[PDB]
Design a protein around this ligand. Structure first.
Ligand SMILES: *[C@@H]1O[C@H](CO)[C@@H](O[C@@H]2O[C@H](CO)[C@@H](O[C@@H]3O[C@H](CO)[C@@H](O)[C@H](O)[C@@H]3O)[C@H](O)[C@H]2NC(C)=O)[C@H](O)[C@H]1NC(C)=O
Ligand SMILES: *[C@@H]1O[C@H](CO)[C@@H](O[C@@H]2O[C@H](CO)[C@@H](O)[C@H](O)[C@H]2NC(C)=O)[C@H](O)[C@H]1NC(C)=O
Ligand SMILES: *[C@@H]1O[C@H](CO)[C@@H](O[C@@H]2O[C@H](CO)[C@@H](O)[C@H](O)[C@H]2NC(C)=O)[C@H](O)[C@H]1NC(C)=O
Ligand SMILES: *[C@@H]1O[C@H](CO)[C@@H](O[C@@H]2O[C@H](CO)[C@@H](O)[C@H](O)[C@H]2NC(C)=O)[C@H](O)[C@H]1NC(C)=O
Ligand SMILES: *[C@@H]1O[C@H](CO)[C@@H](O[C@@H]2O[C@H](CO)[C@@H](O)[C@H](O)[C@H]2NC(C)=O)[C@H](O)[C@H]1NC(C)=O
Ligand SMILES: CC(=O)N[C@@H]1[C@@H](O)[C@H](O)[C@@H](CO)O[C@H]1O
Ligand SMILES: *[C@@H]1O[C@H](CO)[C@@H](O)[C@H](O)[C@H]1NC(C)=O
Ligand SMILES: *[C@@H]1O[C@H](CO)[C@@H](O)[C@H](O)[C@H]1NC(C)=O
Ligand SMILES: *[C@@H]1O[C@H](CO)[C@@H](O)[C@H](O)[C@H]1NC(C)=O
Ligand SMILES: *[C@@H]1O[C@H](CO)[C@@H](O)[C@H](O)[C@H]1NC(C)=O
Ligand SMILES: *[C@@H]1O[C@H](CO)[C@@H](O)[C@H](O)[C@H]1NC(C)=O
Ligand SMILES: *[C@@H]1O[C@H](CO)[C@@H](O)[C@H](O)[C@H]1NC(C)=O
Ligand SMILES: *[C@@H]1O[C@H](CO)[C@@H](O)[C@H](O)[C@H]1NC(C)=O
Ligand SMILES: *[C@@H]1O[C@H](CO)[C@@H](O)[C@H](O)[C@H]1NC(C)=O
Ligand SMILES: *[C@@H]1O[C@H](CO)[C@@H](O)[C@H](O)[C@H]1NC(C)=O
Ligand SMILES: *[C@@H]1O[C@H](CO)[C@@H](O)[C@H](O)[C@H]1NC(C)=O
Ligand SMILES: *[C@@H]1O[C@H](CO)[C@@H](O)[C@H](O)[C@H]1NC(C)=O
Ligand SMILES: *[C@@H]1O[C@H](CO)[C@@H](O)[C@H](O)[C@H]1NC(C)=O
Ligand SMILES: *[C@@H]1O[C@H](CO)[C@@H](O)[C@H](O)[C@H]1NC(C)=O
Ligand SMILES: *[C@@H]1O[C@H](CO)[C@@H](O)[C@H](O)[C@H]1NC(C)=O
Ligand SMILES: *[C@@H]1O[C@H](CO)[C@@H](O)[C@H](O)[C@H]1NC(C)=O
Ligand SMILES: *[C@@H]1O[C@H](CO)[C@@H](O)[C@H](O)[C@H]1NC(C)=O
Ligand SMILES: *[C@@H]1O[C@H](CO)[C@@H](O)[C@H](O)[C@H]1NC(C)=O
Ligand SMILES: *[C@@H]1O[C@H](CO)[C@@H](O)[C@H](O)[C@H]1NC(C)=O
Ligand SMILES: *[C@@H]1O[C@H](CO)[C@@H](O)[C@H](O)[C@H]1NC(C)=O
Ligand SMILES: *[C@@H]1O[C@H](CO)[C@@H](O)[C@H](O)[C@H]1NC(C)=O
Ligand SMILES: *[C@@H]1O[C@H](CO)[C@@H](O)[C@H](O)[C@H]1NC(C)=O
Lengths: 431, 102, 118, 122, 93, 122, 123
């Protein structure tokens, strides 16, 4: 015969959703140098990287972090005044034909009975002509705040961990196309490094595919899911702001010091980016060869620049040395494939509606001296044109905007599960 | 994605079983939706997500299938029911079909 | 309630540019993508394109690429479209439709409907 | 091996690795860390109480006095305990668990009163 | 214990200060004079009778109001023009 | 019957349904919620530890060596267990509860020491 | 005496009164301060309770085991340990080996529960 018996602490899990916690802010619990990766054996676990909730959680966490970083900073509400502007004409080239615009304006001082007369060099995209009088871009939509100069906010590794009764499962398989039964599985106490990078159309920095390029999509063929392309090898990219720029303090009240552009030292030129043309060519060749699997071995492919929309999505948008770079990637995604250094012009901004929100606009202070940013390009975010086209070249265009997808580029190997440690079974033991 | 509606033309009477299908190229699982467009009026949605139906839709309208072939079927038919119907797949809308009294 | 009003009937001559509008009320504008559709008189309903009201992302189809351009306005909760370099075949009816998230099948609810005579 | 060390292994090879898994069950952020920690403590306490009302308190292994109705499963001992994984087992008997728990509780209750009667006999 | 007690006392200070009126409006040019009304030789030029514009219930109306400050709390500008010492440094509550 | 169902019932009747009442024992809005939840957890832990230091760990019901005293209740057993509700009993002995707990704890400590000595008797 | 009354007493007298300690182990930004303080206290107590119960020693304070006492840890005959020493010095002495004690206790309890189930397997 057989009798029930209760086994406690039994290796059984089920998918579930709960809060996680970081490891590495002023509140992160420090990690440890023991990345204990117990290789689960003879296991095979279903994965769906498109619905692991924690990515959204991470997104939400980042949002809140950003907000709490900005709240104890000066609010430039008095700054919304009429601007007497003049187009700059000092050592200005034919590329940047009137982007910087030095604008005088009256500004409040410590004693609001008195005022002063100060200047600036706001970029064009932030100023709009109200009628020669201009206003800052945000002064009618949303309030304006400034980033505290202390924080040099940038990608800092933020490991993740599960809270004492939940497990984090990796997928060590190197051909994981994002969905299905992953054959090789291993748990970890905490996740590896994930740089919380903010980039659209081009996933700057991060983790590269171990063996070969990979194309991920919840459905490759429905022209409405942002395709992720993870590279096998990195692509070197160098972005530069070569205009020697200074910074000045202006007293906006009892202690509120607004950091404003004073004047550009020396010459002025366009702030541009460079990528090795040959390596980019080889990597895009690799990408199209991989795409031939999903779209057949006899399909023409076309690459065309972004199709339109907002400034943040129409262009490569990212952070570089405190400034916000908006590079026009029409100079790369222009090609066709049948069955040296590329140079990218880039614009700059000082008013950013980050996280595509409405009501919270952040002012990015300038940074003294020229700026350089060397980085590894690790993957792209593409979308298929469509048009059906009978059988014809299928066109791919850069996409992005929804930053969550970028988080999915590093949170696809992982999943969170809950342990059910109270099992039962039959055995020949009787009380 | 090739879409071939069937039948192109159809005449049916009040209260009868009427079925309409559309052939696809490959398999799309539940991914399918059918709509109606009464003449003059704006098109409205009948079925989505393969069998899944819209809210406020009488149960007489029901679709299902698999692979390359699915079918929307109706048993009861009140006079407003007949209209132009449209099968849809990806960016490959069906040509449509004509439903008339008797 | 959820209401999708659409622009009025417009009449024109070939070669110019024509603009249409679709105003929404009753739901979170940025949550649902918007498809634009067109049907020629007594013909099927060809898909003009889709737009994302979160960052302004848009995708057209080649059949109608390089001629169409659509944008969004989040303040009044509206979606605008424009067509340039028109051809006589383009005469017909245009519609605005609503799809959840980054999905394209369920075209729940619809606009009043615009007619364009090329 | 370690945490979930033998989760995919055979049944018995997992049966003697229970200690590790049993042991490893224990503002924008402070409130959420507190929520997660207290949810964990509640889960552990619920499991401990469920074991305690069956008389198996303090023992990872235990034994009961309910017959095994074969309707829940008919597999013989060798098939279960040499050619099966714990996840598969939990998948197989998922519906019947509640019934089992109920019967288990009831059995303990009956047993317990019987014990008291024995301690009442002079 | 001492460090955490210090932190707790600091936070208590900030929390008690928080639900109270902000006093930015006193950051204004001060017309101040000495006081010699039944004064002592010892309290010579330590107290100062200052006057200034000030807001009202209604934003349009301004009121000329005066109060008495202590010399340790006030600083001259570059006559008899004066300001609060902290006004150049940080907010005031 | 369900939660608190035997509360108005006879002592003997309610003494058979202890489990049903034991399992059901266990931005500022989240603050008060977590305070209440932690309070409930700590109260269950109060009771669990207090039973643990009485040798009654993991048994809902448990007999002990401390003898009754007619001063505490001059009550016939039939009256207590077949006539008088639980609430009236808790009310009646509310005065003397602490001395019962103290004697019970002392007896349990003495029992543990005796058990330890006996186990070494070899 | 009361809380930690036998802090420096000899081993036997302190062991006689282990109950008071056992009882005393359990009891707006000040809100989260008290919440995390109390949850940390509860977590520490429950961790210790589970660490006891994994040895089969739950439900008791004076629990006996069957790990042989390797003399390498300490060779002090019982007279000094149980009549001429305090708990603090003793805890200082076996601090370097308490982990090995825990591991051996885990192994011994595992073997004993398996043998107990095996005995119950007999008809
Ligand atoms: C991808 O990773 C690279 C490599 O770390 C990042 O480059 C880093 O860029 C930051 C500015 O964004 C540099 O910070 C500055 O560097 C020097 C330090 O002497 C100095 O100018 C400033 O004090 C400041 O710290 C950082 O040095 C630079 N790292 C390297 C190794 O060159 C890059 O920013 C990352 N990409 C993105 C999009 O964040
Ligand atoms: C990016 O590439 C451009 C185009 O090659 C570089 O422009 C040259 O830069 C060098 C110095 O690196 C100058 O001496 C040359 O006169 C420039 N030649 C041109 C414009 O034809 C540019 O320097 C590169 N920028 C980097 C690496 O930051
Ligand atoms: C970006 O700038 C870095 C230097 O800051 C360049 O790095 C060189 O890259 C070449 C290959 O192109 C290597 O052989 C050299 O060893 C590197 N030199 C240094 C000093 O690091 C990099 O090439 C630049 N990228 C582009 C596209 O021009
Ligand atoms: C992005 O850069 C590309 C490449 O320089 C620009 O394309 C050229 O734009 C100019 C100015 O409108 C035209 O005269 C050329 O004919 C365009 N060339 C090609 C090959 O299309 C493009 O305009 C830039 N986009 C933005 C928004 O600045
Ligand atoms: C994408 O590429 C198109 C061409 O396919 C670019 O079109 C140019 O647009 C500018 C205005 O931005 C016009 O002045 C040029 O005449 C256009 N050029 C051509 C050759 O038609 C367009 O700029 C690019 N758009 C981006 C990067 O958003
Ligand atoms: C504005 C004014 O009256 N200031 C006077 C200053 O001139 C004088 O030196 C001081 C006493 O030494 O008292 C004060
Ligand atoms: C500055 O000059 C540029 C180039 O001619 C012109 O487009 C712009 O309107 C001018 N701006 C002002 C403020 O005069
Ligand atoms: C902008 O105008 C101000 C007016 O005083 C002047 O000082 C400044 O140099 C100008 N900037 C440039 C770059 O010419
Ligand atoms: C500053 O304010 C005065 C009036 O006090 C106004 O005439 C002047 O235009 C303002 N300055 C600027 C640069 O607009
Ligand atoms: C603010 O001004 C900009 C200028 O382009 C305009 O697009 C926007 O509609 C304005 N918003 C409001 C609320 O007036
Ligand atoms: C991912 O790969 C697996 C294994 O070949 C396959 O079953 C599944 O359909 C693939 N998913 C997609 C979306 O192509
Ligand atoms: C770029 O790739 C190199 C390859 O050796 C790697 O060592 C380096 O860490 C990468 N840098 C970044 C910023 O990811
Ligand atoms: C689209 O992906 C979903 C989720 O994995 C799946 O159910 C469906 O079959 C896929 N369709 C394809 C790859 O055509
Ligand atoms: C480099 O790009 C050209 C663009 O025409 C392409 O034909 C070629 O295949 C690429 N290089 C290699 C080695 O394939
Ligand atoms: C775009 O690609 C074509 C080849 O299709 C090339 O001739 C042209 O120079 C490219 N334009 C750029 C980089 O602006
Ligand atoms: C900008 O010019 C100033 C002039 O003093 C100099 O100190 C500074 O180093 C320059 N910056 C760069 C990047 O050369
Ligand atoms: C995995 O299965 C193999 C047989 O395929 C078996 O020999 C091995 O012991 C199993 N491993 C584990 C860890 O259970
Ligand atoms: C529960 O019953 C359903 C219906 O028979 C069955 O599909 C499922 O596998 C059962 N699960 C168990 C017994 O764990
Ligand atoms: C009050 O404001 C007036 C102007 O209305 C100014 O002349 C005067 O200086 C201010 N008051 C004082 C005490 O200075
Ligand atoms: C403001 O000026 C006063 C004059 O005494 C000085 O003490 C103070 O430090 C200044 N403020 C700052 C922020 O330095
Ligand atoms: C209530 O008491 C009566 C006798 O007075 C008894 O018959 C009945 O069963 C009791 N009900 C319960 C629920 O105990
Ligand atoms: C019974 O209780 C009374 C009153 O407290 C006390 O005097 C007496 O000693 C107690 N007897 C026992 C056996 O506990
Ligand atoms: C218990 O004691 C009471 C006291 O009056 C007595 O009447 C009754 O008969 C006794 N009941 C029993 C022994 O059941
Ligand atoms: C309980 O204590 C109170 C207060 O001393 C006393 O008056 C009362 O008689 C006691 N009650 C019982 C039921 O013994
Ligand atoms: C301390 O040691 C002396 C030894 O005789 C004794 O008086 C006392 O009881 C001891 N007690 C404690 C509590 O340390
Ligand atoms: C006792 O422990 C010592 C180290 O302290 C070790 O060398 C020895 O082997 C152990 N002996 C046993 C467990 O019998
Ligand atoms: C204990 O051992 C010590 C030496 O370490 C010795 O002096 C003492 O007499 C021993 N006591 C007993 C009771 O054996």
């Amino acid at each position: 015969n057989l009798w029930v018996t209760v086994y406690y602490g039994v290796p059984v899990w089920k998918d579930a959703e709960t809060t996680l916690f970081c490891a590495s802010t002023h509140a992160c619990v420090p990690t440890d140098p023991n990345p204990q990766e117990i290789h689960l054996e003879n296991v095979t676990e279903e994965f769906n990287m498109w619905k692991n909730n924690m990515v959204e959680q991470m997104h939400t966490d980042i949002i809140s972090l950003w907000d709490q970083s900005l709240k104890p900073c000066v609010k430039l509400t008095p700054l919304c005044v009429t601007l007497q502007c003049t187009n700059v004409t000092n050592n200005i080239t034919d590329d940047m034909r009137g982007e910087l615009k030095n604008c005088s304006f009256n500004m409040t001082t410590e004693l609001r009975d008195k005022k002063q007369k100060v200047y600036s060099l706001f970029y064009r995209l932030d100023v709009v002509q109200i009628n020669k009088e201009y206003r800052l871009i945000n002064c009618n939509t949303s309030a304006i705040t400034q980033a505290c100069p202390k924080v040099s906010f940038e990608p800092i590794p933020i490991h993740y961990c599960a809270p004492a009764g939940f497990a984090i499962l990796k997928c060590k398989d190197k051909k994981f196309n994002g969905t299905g039964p992953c054959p090789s599985v291993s748990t970890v106490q905490c996740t590896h490094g994930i740089k919380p990078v903010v980039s659209t159309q081009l996933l700057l920095n991060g983790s590269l595919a171990e063996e070969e390029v990979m194309i991920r999509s919840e459905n490759i063929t429905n022209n409405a899911k942002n395709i992720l392309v993870q590279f096998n090898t990195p692509v070197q990219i160098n972005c530069t702001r070569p205009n020697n720029n200074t910074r000045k303090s202006i007293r906006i009240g009892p202690g509120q010091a607004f950091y404003a552009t004073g004047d550009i030292i020396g010459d002025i030129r366009q702030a541009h980016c460079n990528v090795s043309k040959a390596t980019w060519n080889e990597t895009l060749g690799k990408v199209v060869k991989q795409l031939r699997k999903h779209f057949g071995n006899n399909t023409i492919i076309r690459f065309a620049n972004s199709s339109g929309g907002d400034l943040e999505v129409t262009t490569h948008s990212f952070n570089c040395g405190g400034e916000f770079f908006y590079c026009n990637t029409s100079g790369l995604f222009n090609s066709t494939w049948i069955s040296d250094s590329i140079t990218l012009p880039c614009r700059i901004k000082q008013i950013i509606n980050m996280w595509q929100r409405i009501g919270q606009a952040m002012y990015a202070p300038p940074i003294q001296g020229v700026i350089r940013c060397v980085s590894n390009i690790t993957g792209l975010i593409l979308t298929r044109d469509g048009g059906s086209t009978n059988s014809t070249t299928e066109t791919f265009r850069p996409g992005g905007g929804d930053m969550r997808d970028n988080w999915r580029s590093e949170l696809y190997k992982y999943k969170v599960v809950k342990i059910e440690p109270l099992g039962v079974a039959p055995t020949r033991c009787k009380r | 994605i090739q879409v071939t509606q069937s039948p192109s033309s159809l005449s049916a009477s009040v209260g009868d079983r009427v079925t309409i299908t559309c052939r696809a190229s490959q398999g799309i699982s539940n991914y399918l939706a059918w709509y109606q467009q009464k003449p003059g009026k704006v098109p409205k949605l009948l079925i989505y997500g393969a069998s899944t139906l819209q809210s406020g839709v009488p149960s007489r309208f029901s679709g299902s299938g698999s692979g390359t072939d699915f079918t929307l079927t109706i048993s009861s038919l009140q006079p407003e029911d007949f209209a132009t119907y449209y099968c849809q797949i990806y960016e490959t809308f069906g040509q449509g079909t004509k439903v008339d009294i008797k | 309630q959820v209401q999708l009003v659409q622009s009025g009937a417009e009449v024109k001559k070939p070669g110019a540019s024509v603009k249409v509008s679709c105003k929404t009320s009753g739901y979170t504008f940025t949550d649902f993508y918007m498809h634009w559709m067109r049907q020629a008189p007594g013909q099927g309903l060809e898909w003009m394109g889709w737009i994302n009201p979160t960052g302004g992302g848009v995708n057209y189809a080649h059949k109608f690429q390089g001629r169409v351009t659509m944008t969004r306005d989040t303040s009044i909760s509206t979606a605008y479209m424009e067509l340039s370099r028109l051809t006589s075949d383009d005469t017909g009816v245009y519609y605005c439709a609503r799809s959840p998230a980054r999905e394209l099948l369920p075209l729940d609810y619809w606009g009043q409907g615009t007619l364009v005579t090329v | 091996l370690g945490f979930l060390g033998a989760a995919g292994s055979t049944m018995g090879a997992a049966s003697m690795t229970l200690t590790v898994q049993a042991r490893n069950l224990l503002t924008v952020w402070g409130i959420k860390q507190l929520q997660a920690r207290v949810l964990a403590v509640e889960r552990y306490l619920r499991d401990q109480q469920l074991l305690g009302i069956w008389g198996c308190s303090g023992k990872l292994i235990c034994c009961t006095n309910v017959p095994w109705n074969s309707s829940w499963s008919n597999r013989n001992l060798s098939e279960i305990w040499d050619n099966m994984t714990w996840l598969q087992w939990d998948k197989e008997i998922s519906n019947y668990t509640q019934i089992i728990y109920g019967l288990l509780e009831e059995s303990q209750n009956q047993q317990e009163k019987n014990e008291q009667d024995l301690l009442a006999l002079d | 214990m001492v460090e955490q007690m210090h932190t707790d006392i600091i936070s208590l200070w900030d929390q008690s200060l928080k639900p109270c009126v902000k006093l930015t409006p006193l950051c204004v040019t001060l017309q101040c004079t000495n006081v010699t009304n039944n004064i002592t030789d010892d309290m010579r030029g330590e107290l100062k009778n200052c006057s200034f514009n000030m807001t009202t219930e209604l934003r349009d109306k301004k009121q000329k109001v005066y109060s008495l400050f202590y010399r340790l709390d006030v600083v001259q500008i570059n006559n008899k023009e004066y300001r609060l010492i902290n006004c150049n440094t940080s907010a005031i509550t």
